[model samples]
Target: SFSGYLKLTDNVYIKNADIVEEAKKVKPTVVVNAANVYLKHGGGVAGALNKATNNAMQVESDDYIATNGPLKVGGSCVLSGHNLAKHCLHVVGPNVNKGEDIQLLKSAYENFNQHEVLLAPLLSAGIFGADPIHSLRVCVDTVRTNVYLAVFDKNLYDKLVSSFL
Candidate 1:
């Protein structure tokens, strides 16, 4: 059965049925959002006292998610803007400067789930102008399926289409 969203049960079992048959039975709806190149200023500034990549679009949450043990990832999330039709997903890519790419993505996911709606404008690595496609690929790969991907870079868009192999 299909709920409002395209969420599936945790443990799906199929003996003789084809995977595609089972998948099609669900009748998933995929919405392809438009891809646009957003300027750097479009994103909000990082926190003053927090780490350099905490540019969460000034999202203030009293109950900030902890990242000490299981949440010890480099990235952070905050309520930033309303560009994403309702909310904006502020993500700071892995800090190659501090070498924390993997951690950032992991943390971003944790915080992302905290919100009902989510959106992200991927940075090209520490804002130092690295390859955006690489950064976007990492971002897209990490995002949960129920979440929407709002792309703001032309190069990244091309990469997303090309890298669908």
Candidate 2:
């Protein structure tokens, strides 16, 4: 089982588990959803969250994007988390096709500082292919206190946690 964590500071800790599952368990003020520009809940973190909320996340996203247009990299929108949490911030992250710009990647993390208890995945570090270690840096440094990072695989969790060293 993915239990336990590596403490980076007084309030930051990371461990292995599905982010959505962690949200259900921990109930942070908000769950950060690393979504694509289109905000489609096809797969990955956003997809799972949308599923968890009974597709309401997708419907909210669709509504938000209809008037606001596509979410640009680093840009985000908030939606109801249903029963999972108070809210979920859907952040658009840079992908491989964008050459993995580090600045935009940092922007994806910068917004969550407003919340106290926050739960996030590695942001763009997954299928989107942003550098995992660098993304870890953003997670550790940018977000405010009381944050937990969830990495689904035990092996990958071991690898990323090592970066804090």
Candidate 3:
């Protein structure tokens, strides 16, 4: 329902876009999922993505877990996007009830630092209960390439703009 942007550096920018629709429309190199260690694509970001692909993304994730083992905390995996962008990068972050290791969240961003055109959400926030502003700052400072934080809420957007500006 709303959109805005911030130019962080020469190539990096953060924008407010609906992660499930608009981000896919832009056709980024990868659509990032704030994922679970198992990469199940069950709910939240992963659920919407899987729903959009008619659970094809889930089918691939099953194979991914079978071959690569469960994705560890702060780790990542890549899957051939079934119906959206060319690739999908799944990253797992720590939940507040589970642990308070800040490095775990940082590790999530670090893993995807190389993507040139990446569209992601506020990692570890929302259901994961990590601090939104802290997570946003991690992404803003970490990935130096072209990255978009595909956010969904107007309230979160206000906080991000207020803090990062």
Pitting candidate 1 against candidate 2, the one with the higher lDDT is: 2
TM-scores of the candidates in the order shown = 0.41, 0.90, 0.90
What lDDT tens digits, residue by residue, belong to model 2 across residues 55-136? 9888888888898899888878888878678888788878876675668877888777767777778878778887787888
Residue-wise C-alpha lDDT for candidate 3, range 1-165, written one tens digit per residue: 224667666655666667888655766668888889888777888889889998888888988888888988888988876677889999898878677576789888887776867778888988888889888778767776767677788888877777774
Candidate structures ordered by lDDT, highest first: 2, 3, 1
Candidate of highest TM-score: 3
Model 3 pairs in collision: none
| Model 1 per-residue lDDT tens digits across residues 1-165 | 322221212221112222122223432232111111221332222231122225332223322333221223334433323221223343444445445455454544444455543323344432434455564555445554444333434564555555543
Off by over 4 Å in 2: 1-3, 98-100
Alpha-carbon lDDT, every model? 0.35, 0.80, 0.79
> What's the candidate order when arranged by decreasing TM-score?
3, 2, 1
- Look at candidate 2 and tell me the lDDT of residue 31: 86
The deviation in Å at residue 144 for candidate 2 is 2.7
How high a TM-score does candidate 2 get? 0.90
